[PDB]
Design a protein around this ligand. Sequence first.
Ligand SMILES: C[C@H](C(=O)N1CCC[C@H](C(N)=O)C1)c1nc(F)ccc1Cl
Ligand SMILES: [Zn+2]
Length: 139
Amino acid sequence: SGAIYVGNYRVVNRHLATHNDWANLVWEDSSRDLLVSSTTAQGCDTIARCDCQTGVYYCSSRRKHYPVSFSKPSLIFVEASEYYPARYQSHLMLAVGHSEPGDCGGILRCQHGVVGIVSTGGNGLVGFADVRDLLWLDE
Ligand SMILES: C[C@H](C(=O)N1CCC[C@H](C(N)=O)C1)c1nc(F)ccc1Cl
Ligand SMILES: [Zn+2]
C-alpha cells in the first residue's frame, strides 16, 4: 500500500484504489496502473522533473529503504493477475531489488523528489510506475 500526496491530489496504484478514490476521480489509466483522486487537504509531497535513473525506494515487506538503478520508462509485458489480463504496462521502470505484491504504493525518490511508486515485481525485480511526466500534478 501507499500513495503520493501533492497539492489537492492523491496518486495511488489503480488496482488498489478505494471506493472513495473512484468517487473523487480526477484521472486514471489502466495501461499505467495509475489513478489520481482529489483531496480536501493540501498534500505533503514534491514530484521530481528530471531524467534520473538512480534513486531509493521504500520496501514495506522489509521495513527498509533500498538504493536502485532503474530503466527508463517503457512498455513492458506484465503477466495476467487477478486485477488485469496479460498486457503491456506503459511508463514502467524496472530495477533489481526485493518486492512482493503488498509492496505496491511504496515511493521511489531521487534527489529531486518523487519519481514513482512500486507497481510490479518478482524474482528479485521491482517495477515502478513513473509519475514525472504528469506535469499537471503541481501546475
Ligand atoms: C504478481 C505481482 C505483480 O507484479 N502484479 C500483480 C498486481 C498488479 C500488477 C500490475 N501492475 O499489473 C502486477 C508482484 N509479484 C511479485 F513477485 C512482486 C511484486 C509484485 Cl507487484
Ligand atoms: Zn532526479
